[PDB]
Structure formats: structure tokens, C-alpha cells
From Swiss-Prot:
The record marks K79 as: Lowers pKa of active site Tyr. Changing K70E: No effect on 17beta-HSD activity. It comes from Homo sapiens. It catalyses: a 3alpha-hydroxysteroid + NADP(+) = a 3-oxosteroid + NADPH + H(+); a 3alpha-hydroxysteroid + NAD(+) = a 3-oxosteroid + NADH + H(+); prostaglandin F2alpha + NADP(+) = prostaglandin D2 + NADPH + H(+); prostaglandin F2alpha + NADP(+) = prostaglandin H2 + NADPH + H(+). The gene is AKR1C3. Expressed in many tissues including adrenal gland, brain, kidney, liver, lung, mammary gland, placenta, small intestine, colon, spleen, prostate and testis. High expression in prostate and mammary gland. In the prostate, higher levels in epithelial cells than in stromal cells. In the brain, expressed in medulla, spinal cord, frontotemporal lobes, thalamus, subthalamic nuclei and amygdala. Weaker expression in the hippocampus, substantia nigra and caudate. Coiled coil: none annotated. The keyword Oxidoreductase applies. The active site is at Y50. This is Aldo-keto reductase family 1 member C3. GO terms for cellular component: cytoplasm; cytosol; extracellular exosome; nucleus.
Length: 315
């Protein structure tokens, strides 16, 4: 199942999340991406940040070589990291990602975040207090460099991630805009359902792609351990019982029925296969209203590291 993007390309509506934190051996990304493709995932979400593009690209190429899929059947995303927002760094960052994955093109290239970081060797250049050292880049200039990557054929489609409405607006209002973003990949789940941003995106034919749709991996670098655990929510668990599915499947299905493309990360073979069951059942209107009731403005990523960045998207 795919949605048509505003530049005519197609995005599968369920995607596999590939991030795992640095304690997880790098080889695991190769194994679990092949599992995801075997289970029926066709959209695969990676990034420079993830330090896994080589393993994820090998898993794709393995499944092409063994005859399981064709390249045109796979929708592969990577993302421009925030130390590469200066326009002359954008096509190089993309070419690096293509070389790591050994692919000729990515289906989608995103600006990973609006929170530009000091250019240099470090992924996360940190000040005195562990705040990211910010850079000031007009992201409209970064966008123009993204458009040139599409014109060169390095990315089939281009989009953004972690933009708020006003930051998206800034791009859509750019003089001489050539390509709208096709999507805005953002934190989105029943505790932070982004209904206003969703309505804006739909008005502009921009796909909202939900990450941390299962509640995030609750990494201690970014996530308060006190934050309620999404999949323990009693309304999600009651709906799981009513449908004889699981709280994760309820959270994924919720998004599809709102018109949201949804990612799901799992490094567990059973849960990878379980997550494709999202296409096998439906939530009723009352189930969806119950889930809408859970909204509490909770973005799990909530650290000082970035909450003080001048382009921090949350307010
Ligand atoms: N653009 C950005 O800034 C950004 C930010 C965050 C994430 N992302 C992308 O979005 C992807 C997904 O988000 P996420 O990594 O935060 O994780 P997530 O999809 O919200 O999943 C959270 C946790 O759910 C568990 N899980 C998966 N399926 C389950 C099931 N059926 N039942 C119970 N638990 C289940 C997984 O644990 P197991 O592995 O143990 O199954 C996983 O660690 C990322 O991997 C990345 O691709 C992008
Ligand atoms: O789990 N991931 O996939 C992932 C983890 C961390 C970040 S981040 O840029 O630190 C960030 C920081 C703050 C808010 C949003 C994003 C990007 C990611 O994509």
C-alpha cells in the first residue's frame, strides 16, 4: 500500500525504522533489515546519524541479489545531518550516503532536523553545558541545495523532518521554490498526535510521516524515564484486547486511518513480523476517538541538549 507524493513518486505507507543505539552491534542492522524485507516492509528509513547505512544498504542489495525484490520495489530514505546544512555541504553529504549504502539513488532525502549544528567532524558538537553548538543557516538555502540533488537524480524525492508548521511555511513561501517537500517526518503517536500539523500538511499535499509511533526507544540521552510508556497505556491495551491484536498494532493502525505514513522500529524477529499485521484489521470511529483522547503534548525527545536551540521546533 502506497501514497502518491506531490512530485509523483510513491511512498509505501508502512516503513521500517532502522535506528538502534550505539550499544547495539552494527551487524544487527544488516540482519534485521533483511528480516523486515522478508516480512514485507518495502520502505526503509535510515540516516547519516544512524551509523548503519552500509549495513542497511547491504541488506537491500542482498535481497535484490537473491531475487526477493527489485530496487524499484524498495523505498529507501536517508537524511542530511545537522552539521551539513550549509548549502555547499548538502550534495557531498548525499553522495557519502549513497556510497555507504552502495546505491545509485535514495528514494527520499530529508533534512533531518531544523536545528543546524556547527560544521566539523563531530556528530554532536557540544558546549560547556552539553548544549549542542548551534549554527545559523538560512534553511531556505539548504533547501535549494536539496532541490539540486533531486535535479541531479541523487534523490527521487526530497523532504524535511522535525519541522514545525512555521518552518515548513518558510520553505513553501520561498521565492523561486522549485519542489515542495514531499513529507515532514515528525514525532507522532497518541500522546503527541500532531493533529494541527497534520491538517496543515494535508492542506499542502505534504505527507506526515510518524516516527516514535510506538513511543520511542526511551533512550536515556533524550527521554525522561518518568514519561508514561505509550504501549502501557490502558486505552491502547483495552483496544488491543477488543481486537485481539497488540498495543503496538493499535498505535500503528491509528496512524494509517488518519492519513499518516507510519514507521516502526523493531530489532526482534517476532515483532518485525507482527508489525505488518497493521494491514489486517480496522479501528472503528469510536476506537479512533478514544485514541484521540490520549493526546497530552508529550514529545519523548525532550532534552536541554537541544530545547535551547534557536530553531527548536517545539513551543
Ligand atoms: N527523524 C527523526 O528525528 C527520527 C527520530 C526518531 C526516530 N526516527 C525514525 O523512526 C524509527 C522508529 O522510531 P523509534 O526508533 O523511536 O521507535 P518506535 O518505532 O517508536 O518503536 C519503539 C520500540 O517499540 C518496540 N516494538 C516494536 N514493535 C513492537 C511490537 N509489535 N510490540 C511491542 N514493542 C514493539 C521496539 O523494540 P524492539 O526493537 O525490542 O522490538 C522499539 O524499540 C527510527 O528507527 C528511525 O528510523 C526518526
Ligand atoms: O532515533 N532516532 O532515529 C533519532 C534519534 C535522535 C535524533 S536527534 O536529531 O538527536 C533529535 C533530537 C531531538 C529531537 C528530535 C530529533 C534523530 C533521530 O533520527
Amino acid at each position: 500500500q502506497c501514497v502518491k507524493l506531490n512530485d509523483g513518486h510513491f511512498m509505501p505507507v508502512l516503513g521500517f525504522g532502522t535506528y538502534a543505539p550505539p550499544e547495539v552491534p552494527r551487524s544487527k542492522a544488516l540482519e534485521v533489515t533483511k528480516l523486515a524485507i522478508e516480512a514485507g516492509f518495502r520502505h526503509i528509513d535510515s540516516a547519516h546519524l544512524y551509523n548503519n547505512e552500509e549495513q542497511v544498504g547491504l541488506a537491500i542489495r542482498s535481497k535484490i541479489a537473491d531475487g526477493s525484490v527489485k530496487r524499484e520495489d524498495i523505498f529507501y530514505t536517508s537524511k542530511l545531518w545537522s552539521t551539513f546544512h550549509r548549502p555547499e555541504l548538502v550534495r557531498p553529504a548525499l553522495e557519502n550516503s549513497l556510497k555507504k549504502a552502495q546505491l545509485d539513488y535514495v528514494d527520499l532525502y530529508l533534512i533531518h532536523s531544523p536545528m543546524s549544528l556547527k560544521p566539523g567532524e563531530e556528530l554532536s558538537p557540544t558546549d560547556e553545558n552539553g548544549k549542542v553548538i548551534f549554527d545559523i543557516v538560512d534553511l531556505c538555502t539548504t533547501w535549494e541545495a536539496m532541490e539540486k540533488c533531486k535535479d541531479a537524480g541523487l534523490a527521487k524525492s526530497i523532504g524535511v523532518s522535525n519541522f514545525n508548521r512555521r518552518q515548513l511555511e518558510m520553505i513553501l513561501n520561498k521565492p523561486g521554490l522549485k519542489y515542495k517537500p514531499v513529507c515532514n517526518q515528525v514525532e507522532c503517536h497518541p500522546y503527541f498526535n500532531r493533529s494541527k500539523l497534520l491538517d496543515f500538511c494535508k492542506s499542502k499535499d505534504i505527507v506526515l510521516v510518524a516516527y516514535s509511533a510506538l513511543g520511542s526507544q526511551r533512550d536515556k540521552r533524550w527521554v525522561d524515564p518518568n514519561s508514561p510508556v505509550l504501549l502501557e497505556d490502558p486505552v491502547l491495551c483495552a483496544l488491543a484486547k477488543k481486537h485481539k491484536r497488540t498495543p503496538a498494532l493499535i498505535a500503528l493502525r491509528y496512524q494509517l486511518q488518519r492519513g499518516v505514513v507510519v514507521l516502526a522500529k523493531s530489532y526482534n524477529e517476532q515483532r518485525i513480523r507482527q508489525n505488518v499485521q497493521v494491514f489486517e484489521f480496522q479501528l472503528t470511529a469510536e476506537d479512533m476517538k478514544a485514541i484521540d483522547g490520549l493526546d497530552r503534548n508529550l514529545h519523548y525527545f525532550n532534552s536541554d541538549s537541544f530545547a535551547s536551540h534557536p530553531n527548536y521546533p517545539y513551543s
